[PDB]
Amino acid sequence: MLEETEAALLARVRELFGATLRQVEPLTGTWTNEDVHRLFLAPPSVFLAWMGCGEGRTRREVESRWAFFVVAELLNGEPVNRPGIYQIVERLIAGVNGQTFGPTTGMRLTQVRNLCDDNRINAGVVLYGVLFSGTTPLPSVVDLDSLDDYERHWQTWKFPDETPEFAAHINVNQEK
């Protein structure tokens, strides 16, 4: 039930921030050392990336680890709007803490890394990154449905192969 959860977080982010964030888009893979030169950042924007799932309490639940990578612009060594980016990070933490998002519930904040080395400083982007862990259940077993009239019951006693066969072809619903 992970995809429904990520859709829920994305919808919540869109509702909370609206036009403040230029875009929101799921990220394939954690933020590596070349994501800056490969993605359509269009800052300011936030990316939701699934970082996997550790073992949950039961055999039907897991601790999913999501991440929110927030992007902005740092022209001339100066963030484009430092109060804006701080407010974005803070409101993203606040509105996505504790509240359930689809099947997943108990979103708990785990870590916030500055996550701005030279690769991103010379690229004019800040990458404050939030992490989350949630108790998400596994999908249930697929149900079934069929109705066929019970009419015949074929039983075969497991005798030795070449021993003469013993069986009963019951054929219920027979009247005489």
Binding site: W157, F159, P160, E162, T163, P164
Partner: protein
């Protein structure tokens, strides 16, 4: 006789005639061989029951 397939009987004291072992005349499987799965009349009777 019990090996051959014909059942037996015992004559106990007092002029009484007992049954000994009732067996079915089944000794050979489909391809020769030797199968005891029907040797006892109790086996076929219990299968029927």
């Amino acid at each position: 006789l019990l090996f051959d397939g014909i059942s037996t009987f015992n004559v106990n004291d007092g002029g009484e005639m007992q049954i000994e072992r009732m067996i079915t005349m089944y000794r050979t499987n489909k391809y020769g061989d030797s199968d005891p799965s029907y040797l006892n009349v109790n086996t076929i009777a219990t299968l029927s029951y």
